Design a binder for this molecule. Structure first.
Ligand code: CDL
Ligand code: ZMP
Ligand code: SF4
Ligand code: SF4
Ligand code: ZN
Lengths: 95, 96, 113, 208, 43, 52, 49, 52, 176, 114
């Protein structure tokens, strides 16, 4: 979800944009500002919450040794989903 | 490899060697760029038992240097080591 | 049999190695007699020089003398005898059997600091 | 301790200990320590007034014959009052051995040049002048060898900073390469890496 | 296990010696050919 | 020499500065099929020395 | 004679690029005119042989 | 493992540029000899020390 | 176990002396050298037709840096700064914060490609395979600061080259 | 408190050596201006040599002034021989460096440093 400042400048996924009175916009004059349009905070929120039937799940990000270190997530809160601190995939105990 | 036998004989004669036997350009004799996945072996410390690290700790068996002389008979004169053995001339190809 | 070259560049062949070695060893013992008896350089160098001189007096051959002196060619054994002679002539001047000139400072050789 | 630990050599350890006793009692006027490390390397710590009598001994004595000066080195240690530690690495081809002769100086006391023993030293200690500021007496042509021609200071001292004090750039007003005080667009990031747990109990120092 | 290993009988023998294979006529023959060329030219 | 830089690039990923031999061994094992190509290089390299 | 096969391979390199127009096209763009098996073509027009 | 490979050491005789040239050529020869022996005698196993 | 290069006395019979003088006067070894050079004249050269042909590379190749994502679009980097701790040239500059969903992500990820020594210690220090040194080597610029990459350029190199970086890591992860 | 000398037994031999080094530099300055085709005057270079000598005029240790004579002779040998270029000679004249603030108020204006 990229947006645009009043100066016409794209705001990055970090939130950086130069101010109106900031001289450092002159580096983009006649050139471009390279932002990445694939925001990971948007793409991870599109994922479905995975319903599992255990009390503690494991997550390695998929792909085995191609993902992240394997972590175990406790799913005892029925208020909040159990979110992987590495990959951001989130889990819910189905009962 | 695609050279005609006239140019091949000319080239072999001008070099004086059989050049087609040992071509410095490479063809289908080299390895495939796509290989099957390997199963690499593990070391000797991948054991589930009798593998306490205190019994294979290299860095902790390093000692401080043993002080021989410090300023706090008819004994034999020594060398740092026995004198080096004279090398043998090569039986393969001595050039003699 | 007159070995044609020593194999080393700038090291000429000695025509009469035994007489040259006897002269150099007796000259080392002569210079080395000027050192005091308590000095370990005198005792150690007299020991090795008397051993080498006994071996030179015991062997007529050049090749077997090279194999039992155990110093390579006979010409670099002669070179080593000359270096030992020059060293002992310097050791007369230096007098290193004397006690230590100065103790080092208190943690001068302490590693790690 | 078989596969992953380095195999200890006891024979060369014993031989280097005996030869260190030999060197120490032939030359007790200068020899201050003799030590053999666990990986079997002999160090002869001597007094700086005996650089030449020791090194001419080990080069010329018929039980030493250290005919090659492999490397000559200084080490700055600022916690010592003699902050420089001059290190001679010697190679005896006859007995197939190596020895280390270590001595010391501070900023002001000269060391006698060993070019009359090993001509190989002619640049090394010259490098030690350029990098550490250890003056060598009776050196044939003592000058800088590695730094720039107008370079002030001696870089391999540990109170000298990693980047220098001056940087160079071409100035177009003066048509010339000029020196200015160094200003980095990004400072070198000093990392504090040392763990606060002791790694090696064998090397523990006694407390105060 | 699967590891980069040589073949079972090992690799073939690899040549490593000098091969400067001594071609050409003798010195007598080369001077004779040169003299014969001179004699043909002179004639 | 270009083929030997291909050997460095296959073993480490850099043609010159491999950072491959490390304290404790090497960084990474040989890729499969590398030693066959080292054989095919070495079998023919003698003729290259001979013509030099 | 094996020179006739060389000239015939050159003439079928001419005939293999789709005539003289394709031959001179690949000669001036590529500075090479040898023919290969078309392995594929991407969505940009790069042709792989 | 140089104590386990078999190779010769080329020795000059005159100490000039030409003997050093021939020594480097014959060291390339003996390097091909060592590479043949290393390709024939490559053991299996790990490539780092297993002290982690 | 040693050999003597150049320890040959030439033979002194009239045959060998005449051979050496015919070599001297008739230039036999010079014609040998001309013949070896003429033998290379009639060889197919080693020249590849760059840029239409490319030099062969391996999947271990260390080229242009890129930041990878998971197969959900979430970026792999969790701001742990191991790559910039291991970096031998101090080419990596990382700043982080918890972002709006509490995830541990970077706000700054700079790689100076003019300090970088292209040794790949960052990709092998990375615990999540986030920073990788990809297959691209054709990224020469006309300006110095176009090689001063920030996080946007690195995530765009990941999005640009992921179809190839995933296959190189597929072919080489079992050696790692 | 008893140390080994470098060249000088006391300060007087050291001042003899400092004096002879200043003599040698004073003689060399016109040759240095001529062959490096410097655009300073000879008087300006002799003033710079005077400044580089009088910077060190507070040193009361014979060993330190022995080392200063040694380093000055090394600079002189690198100048007599064309080992320095024009740039290494002109680095004594900090031309591209803007004059720093010297008083308190302007250093207060420009930044944080004393
Ligand atoms: C000598 C005069 C030239 C005679 C032709 C010649 O020697 O051809 C090389 C021909 C093949 O040489 P090769 O080194 O074995 O090359 C093998 C390749 O596979 C053969 O090459 P290829 O398989 O890659 O075939 C493609 C090649 C085919 O090559 C040719 O058509 C050769 C060019 C012929 C002219 O065609 C091209 O690359 C197009 C080249 C077009 C321009 C050639 C230059 C023209 C110069 C005159 C104007 O040589 C011989 O057959 C032996 C010498 C013949 C001497 C003839 C009597 C004198
Ligand atoms: C073109 C420019 C090139 C610049 C040349 C750079 C060479 C500079 C070499 C520096 C050498 C020195 O500064 S050694 C001087 C240190 N002397 C002392 O600490 C003792 C005090 N000495 C002096 O005051 C000297 O003026 C005298 C003449 C020895 C004594 O004067 P006082 O008595 O009244
Ligand atoms: S390849 Fe090496 S130098 Fe470059 S960023 Fe990675 S760790 Fe740093
Ligand atoms: S790229 Fe990898 S090593 Fe670097 S901070 Fe991110 S997760 Fe850590
Ligand atoms: Zn996960």
């Amino acid at each position: 979800g990229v947006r645009t400042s009043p100066t016409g400048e794209k705001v990055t996924h970090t939130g950086q944009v130069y101010d109106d009175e900031d001289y450092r916009r002159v580096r983009f004059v006649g050139r471009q500002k390279e932002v990445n349009e694939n925001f990971a905070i948007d793409l991870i929120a599109e994922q479905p919450v995975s319903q599992v039937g255990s009390r503690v799940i494991s997550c390695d990000g998929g792909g085995g040794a191609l993902g992240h270190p394997r972590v175990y997530i406790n799913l005892d809160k029925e208020t909040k989903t159990g979110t992987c601190g590495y990959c951001g995939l989130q889990f819910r105990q189905q009962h | 490899a695609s050279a005609t036998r006239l140019i091949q004989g000319l080239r072999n004669w001008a070099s004086g060697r059989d050049l087609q036997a040992k071509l410095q350009l490479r063809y289908q004799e080299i390895s495939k760029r796509t290989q099957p996945p390997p199963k690499l072996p593990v070391g000797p410390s991948h054991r589930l038992s009798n593998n306490y690290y205190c019994a294979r700790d290299g860095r902790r068996e390093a000692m401080p240097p043993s002080i021989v002389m410090s300023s706090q008979s008819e004994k034999k004169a020594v060398s740092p080591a026995p004198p080096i053995k004279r090398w043998e001339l090569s039986q393969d190809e001595p050039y003699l | 049999l007159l070995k044609k070259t020593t194999g080393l560049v700038g090291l000429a062949v000695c025509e009469t190695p035994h007489e040259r070695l006897k002269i150099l060893y007796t000259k080392i013992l002569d210079v080395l007699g000027h050192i005091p008896k308590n000095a370990a350089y005198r005792k150690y160098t007299e020991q090795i020089t008397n051993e080498k001189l006994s071996i030179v007096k015991a062997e007529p051959d050049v090749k077997k003398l090279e194999e039992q002196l155990q110093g390579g060619q006979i010409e670099e054994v002669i070179l080593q005898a000359e270096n030992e002679l020059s060293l002992a002539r310097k050791m007369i001047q230096w007098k290193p059997w004397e006690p230590l000139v100065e103790e080092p400072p208190a943690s001068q050789w302490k590693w790690p600091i | 301790t078989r596969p992953t630990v380095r195999p200890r050599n006891d024979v060369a350890h014993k031989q280097l200990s005996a030869f260190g006793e030999y060197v120490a009692e032939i030359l007790p006027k200068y020899v201050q320590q003799v030590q053999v490390s666990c990986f079997s390397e002999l160090e002869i710590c001597i007094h700086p007034d005996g650089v030449i009598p020791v090194l001419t001994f080990l080069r010329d004595h018929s039980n030493a014959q250290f005919k090659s000066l492999a490397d000559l080195t200084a080490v700055d240690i600022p916690t010592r009052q003699n902050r420089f530690e001059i290190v001679y690495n010697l190679l005896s081809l006859r007995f197939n051995s190596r020895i280390r002769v270590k001595t010391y100086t501070d900023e002001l006391t000269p060391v006698e040049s060993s070019v009359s023993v090993y001509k190989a030293a002619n640049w090394y200690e010259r490098e030690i002048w350029d990098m550490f500021g250890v003056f060598f007496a009776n050196h044939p042509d003592l000058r800088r060898i590695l730094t720039d021609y107008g370079f002030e200071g001696h870089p391999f001292r540990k109170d000298f900073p990693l980047s220098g004090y001056v940087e160079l750039r071409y100035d177009d007003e003066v048509k010339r390469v000029v020196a200015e005080p160094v200003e980095l667009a990004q400072e070198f990031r000093k990392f504090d890496l040392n763990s606060p747990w002791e790694a090696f109990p064998a090397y523990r120092q006694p407390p105060e | 296990v699967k590891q980069d290993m040589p073949p079972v009988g090992g690799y073939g023998p690899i040549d490593y010696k000098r091969n400067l294979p001594r071609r050409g006529l003798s010195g007598y023959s080369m001077f004779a050919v040169g003299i014969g060329a001179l004699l043909f030219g002179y004639w | 020499r270009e083929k030997m830089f291909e050997f460095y690039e296959r073993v480490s990923g850099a043609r010159m500065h491999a950072a491959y031999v490390r304290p404790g061994g090497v960084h990474q094992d040989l890729p499969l099929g590398l030693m066959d190509d080292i054989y095919e290089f070495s079998k023919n390299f003698s003729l290259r020395i001979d013509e030099l | 004679m094996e020179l006739l096969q060389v000239l015939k391979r050159g003439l079928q390199q001419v005939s293999g690029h789709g005539g003289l127009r394709g031959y001179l096209r690949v000669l001036f763009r590529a500075n090479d005119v040898r023919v290969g098996t078309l392995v594929g073509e991407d969505k940009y027009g790069n042709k792989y042989y | 493992v140089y104590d386990q490979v078999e190779f010769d050491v080329p020795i000059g005789s005159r100490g000039d540029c030409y003997d050093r040239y021939l020594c480097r050529v014959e060291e390339m020869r003996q390097s091909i000899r060592i590479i043949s022996q290393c390709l024939n005698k490559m053991p299996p196993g790990e490539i780092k020390v297993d002290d982690a | 176990t040693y050999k003597y290069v150049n320890l040959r006395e030439p033979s002194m019979d009239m045959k060998s002396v005449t051979d050496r003088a015919a070599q001297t006067l008739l230039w036999t070894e010079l014609i040998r050298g001309l013949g070896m050079t003429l033998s290379y004249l009639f060889r197919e050269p080693a020249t590849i037709n760059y840029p239409f042909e490319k030099g062969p590379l391996s999947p271990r190749f260390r080229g242009e840096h890129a930041l990878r994502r998971y197969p959900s679009g979430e970026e792999r980097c969790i701001a742990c700064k191991l790559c910039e701790a291991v970096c031998p040239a101090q080419a990596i500059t990382i700043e982080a914060e918890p972002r709006a969903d509490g995830s541990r992500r970077t706000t700054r990820y700079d790689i100076d490609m003019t300090k970088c020594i292209y040794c790949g210690f960052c990709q092998e220090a990375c615990p999540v395979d986030a920073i990788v040194e990809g297959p691209n080597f054709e990224f020469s610029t006309e300006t110095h600061e176009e090689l001063l990459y920030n996080k946007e350029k690195l995530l765009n190199n990941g999005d640009k080259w992921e179809a190839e970086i995933a296959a190189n890591i597929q072919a080489d992860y079992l050696y790692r | 408190t008893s140390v080994k000398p470098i060249f000088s037994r006391d300060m007087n031999e050291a001042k003899r050596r400092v004096r002879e080094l200043y003599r040698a530099w004073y003689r060399e300055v016109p040759n240095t201006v001529h062959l490096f085709q410097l655009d300073i005057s000879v008087k300006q270079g002799r003033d710079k040599v005077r400044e580089m000598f009088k910077k060190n005029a507070h040193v009361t240790d014979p060993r330190v002034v022995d080392l200063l004579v040694i380093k000055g002779k090394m600079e002189l040998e690198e100048t007599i021989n064309v080992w320095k270029q024009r740039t290494h000679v002109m680095r004594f004249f900090h031309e591209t460096e803007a004059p720093r603030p010297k008083d308190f108020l302007s250093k207060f204006y420009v930044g944080h440093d004393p």
